[PDB]
Amino acid sequence: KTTLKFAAFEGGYGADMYKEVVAAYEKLNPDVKIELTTSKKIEDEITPGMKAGNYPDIVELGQGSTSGLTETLLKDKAIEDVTDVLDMKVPGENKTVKDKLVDGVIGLYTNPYGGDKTYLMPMYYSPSGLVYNKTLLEQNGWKMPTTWDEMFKLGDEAKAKGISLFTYPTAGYFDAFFNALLADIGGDQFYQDVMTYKKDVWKTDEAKEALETTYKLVTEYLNPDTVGYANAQDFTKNQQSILDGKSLFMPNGTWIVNEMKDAPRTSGFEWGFAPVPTVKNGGTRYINTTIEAVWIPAKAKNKEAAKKFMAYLYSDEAASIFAKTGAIQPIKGNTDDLASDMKVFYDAYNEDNVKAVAGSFSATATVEGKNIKDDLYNAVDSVASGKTTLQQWQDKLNETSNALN
Ligand SMILES: CC(=O)N[C@@H]1[C@@H](O[C@@H]2O[C@H](CO)[C@H](O)[C@H](O)[C@H]2O)[C@@H](O)[C@@H](CO)O[C@@H]1O
Ligand code: NA
Question: In three state form, how does the secondary structure of 132-145 look?
């Protein structure tokens, strides 16, 4: 009887799970009719200056997406404060959302302006690191590196066999890669300092080491097809080079299994997963806990109905639907009895001297014509193409970060 408009990003876990969650919510609450739109081009729904009666009431779209829409609306103060959803009862259950969320998931990603106001409620719960064909490493006697010195020496051996060390799907996937590498090199406070624009942080030895390591990786050890395919249309072709045996490693998360399930692959292929290597031998390695986001536009017409549906995304019923393709909602218990195809990913948290990192950049400050994510992540394409030097990369980051500070 009351219509709610829900726009959801169609990513590697698939669109059908959202159709099924919506149907389950309507069975629980028959007086709600949800109009669901799923698409790889969500930005079509929410356009600048749109009329309030035409906005979606609720949107699933993480930070880091192709369009950058979530960050654009944060900059414009155009996303509703949904802190109150944390204290709402989950529909169909006798617990609140906060009762169910895993500890520590609320943080700089979900609370982008700092402080205790939540604007991006967390979706999924994917370790990110490096994926590879475990069988290919085994066939060659290659051990998974824990250091970049080992990685580069492995790249030297792999090239002799016609294999490039590294590819990436798009440059945006350096979000999780740098969260891990920065924490590896500098520690927890250093990572926080980068995300919050501490003065001169990109001129530290720690930050320079992160960039120098990544510069060498993408200028000496990159599959030559990577940059040309590193876009929303062709990213799966870069991923296909792992399945075809032409690249060894790429940064990714657990949606890669479902996303590539129908693709051809080399005989005996099996997914491997590891943390990003660190620099010092025996050093702590971090796994990034990658989440997407669900949120309510400030111009939404039906915010209260959207908040109740949002709370239902943390129900056991919803979690069971999402888990069929590997999408693991960030609620307690949801990694007990994991599907067998997820074991290789979540087992990485059990390696010795491995820790978790998570987050994104603070959205408190904005500067005209500057975007720190373009300067850190998107710049990798230019670096790999030989159009940005290592010094230019660092200098532009320090300039933008200091201006945001
Ligand atoms: C190209 C694309 O849309 N990929 C989807 C993923 O989105 C990427 O996520 C990574 C995470 O490290 C990074 O933020 C990229 O910039 C972003 O494009 C992701 O949404 C997954 C799972 O839903 O689906 C696609 O693979
Ligand atoms: Na489970």
Answer: EEHHHHHHCCCCCC
Whether the CB of 43 sits within 6 Å of ligand 1: no
Q: Name, in order, each residue with C-beta under 8 angstroms of 145's C-beta and a sequence gap of 6 or more.
A: 151, 154, 277
Backbone φ and ψ for 252, nearest 5 degrees, come out as -170, 175
Kindly tell me the burial class for residue 386, based on how many C-beta atoms sit within 10 Å of its own C-beta (0-12, 13-18, 19 or more): exposed
**Is beta strand 58-60 parallel, antiparallel or unpaired with respect to 271-274?**
unpaired
Residue 369 has phi, psi (to 5 degrees) of 70, 20
CA of 92 relative to ligand 1 center, distance in Å: 31
CATH of 2-125+290-340, one of 3.40.190.10, 3.90.1170.30, 3.40.50.1000, 3.40.50.2300: 3.40.190.10
Q: What is the resolution of this structure in A?
A: 1.4
| Method of determination used here | X-ray
The whole-angstrom separation of Cα 209 and Cα 344 is 29
Torsional sign, CA 10, 11, 15, 21: negative
- Give 205 Cα–ligand 1 centroid separation in angstroms: 30
Residue 46 alpha carbon to ligand 2 centre in Å? 34
What stretches of 5-133 show up as alpha helix (H) in DSSP? 16-28, 69-75, 97-100
* Placement of tokens 């990786």 in the chain: 217
Q: Ligand 2 centre from 323 Cα, in Å?
A: 8
Fold of 128-288+360-404: D-Maltodextrin-Binding Protein; domain 2 (3.40.190)
For a substitution probing ligand 1, which of 255, 289, 325 has the most ligand atoms within 8 Å of its CB?
255
Ligand 1 atom, smallest distance to 64 CA: 14
As to burial, measured by CB atoms within 10 angstroms (0-12 exposed, 13-18 middle, 19+ buried), residue 168 is buried
The residues that bridge with 3 in the sheet, in sequence order, are 33
Start and end residues for every CATH 3.40.190.10 domain found in the chain = 2-125+290-340, 128-288+360-404
Q: Does the beta carbon of 360 sit less than 6 angstroms from any atom of ligand 1?
A: no
Q: Would the CB of 12 count as within 6 Å of ligand 1?
A: yes
Tokens read off for 319: 């979690």
